[PDB]
């Protein structure tokens, strides 16, 4: 069983928001964050609630060797839709994005469209001073700011006070970028023959005191307290590898733009020259970066997405945007830093008699948030029917684009792999 007592975070659940570092300084910051005295709810065990996931969640535990594993994320938890699984096994993790079907308890049996998995140094440390009674503390945060699912701890021991109360900042772990949907938040448990402290983060503006060493030792809130609102106001590499960008512009089946194979491209020497040969460049259109001055930067990641689409949708595609592809298919975000190539290709796309493999996305509930996809086929409701039958009234979403040979360039296959490129404070990988 559990039980869901509520208790005080107090001054509790600050990290570091950037890897920049300060001394004697009150730098002022607005991000997630744990509000203080904010309502954390604390379990038990002795079943194991899906928890719902929003605006990240913090998360607390104090135990006396391990009997927590690990945390299941996505939505539905089912076979079918991707989800995504930390357990932290034996003396390593075990990260992983994967459409889990169930085990109801070996804690998955799917093996479908999963891989996209990344291991890592375990996220548990625990020492003893040849006693039980150091009952270290183990805070997590954890965030999807466009997908890059963030993770921040920090292990404390020497607690006499539950849930001390003293400050303690959050250093960053692992940054991976799953770009999934997540809504609900479950936990792995373990055997043997009181922790579990959940908080959500919302969106707040923190004042916060950083050491000459750089440690964070206090911070004030800026919507909590009167006091605390006035005192917020006054406050190359060694790397040689040429880049895949040959396999990326040498692929045979760009994927429709219903789903945006995205490609990330990391560990790697970025000479554009290669880009540069094999496609007659019919759009370059860079927007962050001059194409020009490509070679001299250094970008902490790069990804290529790449879409065969028709002649005007390249056109369409670029930052702020419209129409039935920027809506509901592809939507670059406004703040774009990157390129997109889009040259012609009528010669892998076309035969005779036809071809009408590639497909697209006229019909969503919504529009489509930037870099974010959405395989599904379902019918979209016309009246007050849901049909999911198809016809008039109940339509499929989407529709062929089927390509053949002898068409108008407004209508001809454009071959369109967007490159999405990282110039922000943090280690280069690529240059
Ligand atoms: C910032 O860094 C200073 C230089 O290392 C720290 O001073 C030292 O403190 C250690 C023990 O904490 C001593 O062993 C050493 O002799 C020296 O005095 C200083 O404490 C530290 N300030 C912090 C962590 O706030
Ligand atoms: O080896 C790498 O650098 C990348 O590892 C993973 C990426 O998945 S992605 O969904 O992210 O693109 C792949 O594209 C590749
Ligand atoms: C915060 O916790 C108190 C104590 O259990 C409870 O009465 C109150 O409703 C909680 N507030 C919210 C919004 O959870
Ligand atoms: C946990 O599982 C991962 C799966 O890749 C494995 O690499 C790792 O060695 C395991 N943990 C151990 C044995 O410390
Ligand atoms: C993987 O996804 C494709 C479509 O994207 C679907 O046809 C296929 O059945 C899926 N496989 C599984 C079971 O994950
Ligand atoms: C994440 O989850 C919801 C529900 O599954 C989904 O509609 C959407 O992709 C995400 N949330 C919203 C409303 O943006
Ligand atoms: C490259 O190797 C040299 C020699 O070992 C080392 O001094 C340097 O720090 C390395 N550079 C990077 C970026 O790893
Ligand atoms: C792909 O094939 C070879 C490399 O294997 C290369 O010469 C050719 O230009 C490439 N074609 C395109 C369109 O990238």
Same mark, same amino acid.
């Given at each position: 069983?559990?039980?869901?007592?509520?208790?005080?975070?107090?001054?509790?659940?600050?990290?570091?928001?950037?890897?920049?570092?300060?001394?004697?300084?009150?730098?002022?910051?607005?991000?997630?964050?744990?509000?203080?005295?904010?309502?954390?709810?604390?379990?038990?065990?002795?079943?194991?609630?899906?928890?719902?996931?929003?605006?990240?969640?913090?998360?607390?535990?104090?135990?006396?060797?391990?009997?927590?594993?690990?945390?299941?994320?996505?939505?539905?938890?089912?076979?079918?839709?991707?989800?995504?699984?930390?357990?932290?096994?034996?003396?390593?993790?075990?990260?992983? !994005?994967?459409?889990?079907?169930?085990?109801?308890?070996?804690?998955?049996?799917?093996?479908?469209?999963?891989?996209?998995?990344?291991?890592?140094?375990?996220?548990?440390?625990?020492?003893?001073?040849?006693?039980?009674?150091?009952?270290?503390?183990?805070?997590?945060?954890?965030?999807?700011?466009?997908?890059?699912?963030?993770?921040?701890?920090?292990?404390?021991?020497?607690?006499?006070?539950?849930?001390?109360?003293?400050?303690?900042?959050?250093?960053?772990?692992?940054?991976?970028?799953?770009?999934?949907?997540?809504?609900?938040?479950?936990?792995?448990?373990?055997?043997?023959?009181?922790?579990?402290?959940?908080?959500?983060?919302?969106?707040?503006?923190?004042?916060?005191?950083?050491?000459?060493?750089?440690?964070?030792?206090?911070?004030?809130?800026?919507?909590?307290?009167?006091?605390?609102?006035?005192?917020?106001?006054?406050?190359?590499?060694? !790397?040689?590898?040429?880049?895949?960008?040959?396999?990326?512009?040498?692929?045979?089946?760009?994927?429709?733009?219903?789903?945006?194979?995205?490609?990330?491209?990391?560990?790697?020497?970025?000479?554009?020259?290669?880009?540069?040969?094999?496609?007659?460049?019919?759009?370059?259109?860079?927007?962050?970066?001059?194409?020009?001055?490509?070679?001299?930067?250094?970008?902490?990641?790069?990804?290529?997405?790449?879409?065969?689409?028709?002649?005007?949708?390249?056109?369409?595609?670029?930052?702020?945007?419209?129409?039935?592809?920027?809506?509901?298919?592809?939507?670059?975000?406004?703040?774009?830093?990157?390129?997109?190539?889009?040259?012609?290709?009528?010669?892998?796309d076309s035969?005779?008699?036809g071809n009408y493999d590639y497909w697209?996305?006229?019909?969503?509930?919504?529009?489509?948030?930037?870099?974010?996809?959405?395989?599904?086929?379902?019918?979209?409701?016309?009246?007050?029917?849901?049909?999911?039958?198809?016809?008039?009234?109940?339509?499929?979403?989407?529709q062929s684009y089927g390509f053949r040979?002898?068409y108008?360039?407004?209508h001809?296959p454009?071959?369109?792999?967007?490159?999405?490129?990282?110039?922000?404070?943090?280690?280069?990988?690529?240059?």
């Amino acid at each position: 069983t559990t039980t869901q007592s509520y208790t005080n975070s107090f001054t509790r659940g600050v990290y570091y928001p950037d890897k920049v570092f300060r001394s004697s300084v009150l730098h002022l910051t607005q991000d997630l964050f744990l509000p203080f005295f904010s309502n954390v709810t604390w379990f038990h065990a002795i079943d194991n609630p899906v928890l719902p996931f929003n605006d990240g969640v913090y998360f607390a535990s104090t135990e006396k060797s391990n009997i927590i594993r690990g945390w299941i994320f996505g939505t539905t938890l089912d076979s079918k839709t991707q989800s995504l699984l930390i357990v932290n096994n034996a003396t390593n993790v075990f990260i992983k !994005v994967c459409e889990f079907q169930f085990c109801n308890d070996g804690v998955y049996s799917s093996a479908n469209n999963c891989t996209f998995e990344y291991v890592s140094q375990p996220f548990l440390m625990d020492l003893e001073g040849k006693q039980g009674n150091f009952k270290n503390l183990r805070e997590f945060v954890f965030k999807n700011i466009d997908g890059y699912f963030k993770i921040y701890s920090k292990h404390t021991p020497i607690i006499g006070r539950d849930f001390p109360q003293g400050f303690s900042a959050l250093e960053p772990l692992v940054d991976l970028p799953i770009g999934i949907n997540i809504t609900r938040f479950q936990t792995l448990l373990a055997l043997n023959r009181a922790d579990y402290y959940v908080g959500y983060l919302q969106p707040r503006t923190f004042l916060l005191k950083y050491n000459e060493n750089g440690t964070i030792t206090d911070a004030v809130d800026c919507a909590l307290d009167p006091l605390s609102e006035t005192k917020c106001t006054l406050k190359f590499p060694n !790397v040689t590898n040429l880049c895949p960008f040959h396999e990326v512009f040498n692929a045979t089946r760009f994927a429709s733009v219903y789903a945006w194979n995205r490609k990330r491209i990391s560990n790697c020497v970025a000479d554009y020259s290669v880009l540069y040969n094999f496609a007659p460049f019919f759009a370059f259109k860079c927007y962050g970066v001059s194409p020009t001055k490509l070679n001299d930067l250094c970008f902490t990641n790069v990804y290529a997405d790449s879409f065969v689409i028709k002649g005007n949708e390249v056109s369409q595609i670029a930052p702020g945007q419209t129409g039935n592809i920027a809506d509901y298919n592809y939507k670059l975000p406004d703040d774009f830093t990157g390129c997109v190539i889009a040259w012609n290709s009528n010669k892998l796309d076309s035969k005779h008699s036809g071809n009408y493999d590639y497909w697209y996305r006229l019909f969503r509930k919504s529009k489509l948030k930037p870099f974010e996809r959405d395989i599904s086929t379902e019918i979209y409701q016309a009246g007050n029917k849901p049909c999911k039958g198809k016809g008039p009234n109940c339509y499929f979403p989407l529709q062929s684009y089927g390509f053949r040979p002898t068409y108008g360039v407004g209508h001809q296959p454009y071959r369109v792999v967007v490159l999405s490129f990282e110039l922000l404070h943090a280690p280069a990988t690529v240059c």
